[PDB]
Amino acid sequence: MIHLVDYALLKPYLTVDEAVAGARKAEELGVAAYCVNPIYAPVVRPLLRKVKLCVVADFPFGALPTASRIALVSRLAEVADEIDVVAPIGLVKSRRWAEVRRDLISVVGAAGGRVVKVITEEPYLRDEERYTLYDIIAEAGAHFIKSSTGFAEEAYAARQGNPVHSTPERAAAIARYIKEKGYRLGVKMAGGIRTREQAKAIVDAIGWGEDPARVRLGTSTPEALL
Amino acid sequence: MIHLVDYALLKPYLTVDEAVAGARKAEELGVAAYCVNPIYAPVVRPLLRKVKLCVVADFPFGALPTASRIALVSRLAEVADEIDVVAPIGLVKSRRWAEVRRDLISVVGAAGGRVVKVITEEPYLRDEERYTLYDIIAEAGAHFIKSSTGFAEEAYAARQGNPVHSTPERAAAIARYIKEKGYRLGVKMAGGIRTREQAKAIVDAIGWGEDPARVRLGTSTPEALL
Ligand SMILES: [Zn+2]
Ligand SMILES: [Zn+2]
């Protein structure tokens, strides 16, 4: 199960030494990828060989102008293996679908070939928004739907009717939809996955077995599940 | 005192309608500036006449590589009157001063003369970091030091021995240092400023009167101020 893990150290106060130590630990554990803020991509790049270098973009708000977002992703694609970009959360809540799809198609297209995961921030969404968004993400040709940033607020999330942490039910809901629509999209759950038990539950919930190309587990405590 | 206020609506889930409402409210109140995430800059631009258009950059982590930060600030300066960019927090915690100054000097200078405020994120800093950071901010030619993003984590703050909300003690300390070093820098306290008395407390502590070019009060509840 360790090979389905995207080991994430994304706190803004993470230091160079900590980022370097993380990469080293990522390689030894054999995780699927190591995710860090863009600033540390160059220093970590040399330490990764088998494990993929994953970077977040317009994280964690997804509140940058589309023009800046495509530009950022374009640069990032020069050194990162995979890019986890936040959806335009604000525009989604505004139900500005025309703008949401214009943004995601252009942003994903800017990654030029790299594996792109769009963070939907499930804690902030309602059902009428999430499925329309999933359709847009498939339309954009993204590789994965990442459930959350790991920085969602509990208060607002609750008002939208959601828990802040990943649950097997949400994971299954996303996986069921993709499968039913026949989309070529993987599912990456993140948030509150710090025990091997919970992780296992999410994998069984998604129902695709342990396929790294279709399933990823985002966590800051990888050792805990292997 | 409302004229020293920087009315900020930065939640990623804020809607377009909410951002418009905010601009209208900003103009009615006569606050110094209205701060939003760059995505809403264009739509708010028209509703702002007397009030300055303020936008945050690489917010709230300040964890993008320098090149992207420069490009971002350059683009933002084309439509925003003021730019509140986050300092490279991770690098500051790493005490990578050579890199921190190369970054801030470059980023601030990419603003093309616009009013630039560098967010220090006081809740995450120690004395061994903040003063050297202030020196760098001055060396970079910024107009203001913004105390915090408003999204600092309570746990890490406590770990660093700092409160998350703004305090007169902190404001006075920043002011005293800039006065002693002769820096041409303003002080913008933000975060937890909920009342008129708290706001007055901060203004008195800074000791520069109600001078907008040197003192700002960032808050999401401006009405409470006056
Ligand atoms: Zn497969
Ligand atoms: Zn003055």
Curated annotation (Swiss-Prot), chains A, B:
Catalytic reaction list: 2-deoxy-D-ribose 5-phosphate = D-glyceraldehyde 3-phosphate + acetaldehyde
Location relative to the cell: Cytoplasm
pH dependence: Optimum pH is 6.0 for 2-deoxy-D-ribose 5-phosphate cleavage.
This protein's UniProt keywords: Cytoplasm, Lyase, Schiff base
Enzyme class: lyase
EC id: 4.1.2.4
Pathway stated in the Swiss-Prot or TrEMBL entry: Carbohydrate degradation; 2-deoxy-D-ribose 1-phosphate degradation; D-glyceraldehyde 3-phosphate and acetaldehyde from 2-deoxy-alpha-D-ribose 1-phosphate: step 2/2
Domain of life, source organism: Archaea
SUPFAM superfamilies on file: Aldolase
Tagged with keyword DNA-binding: no
Active site positions, chain numbering: 84 (proton donor/acceptor), 146 (schiff-base intermediate with acetaldehyde), 188 (proton donor/acceptor)
Keyword match Transcription: no
Record-stated family: Belongs to the DeoC/FbaB aldolase family. DeoC type 1 subfamily.
Subunit structure, as described in the record: Homodimer.
Protein name as annotated: Deoxyribose-phosphate aldolase
Organism: Pyrobaculum aerophilum (strain ATCC 51768 / DSM 7523 / JCM 9630 / CIP 104966 / NBRC 100827 / IM2)
Lineage start: Archaea, Thermoproteota, Thermoprotei, Thermoproteales, Thermoproteaceae
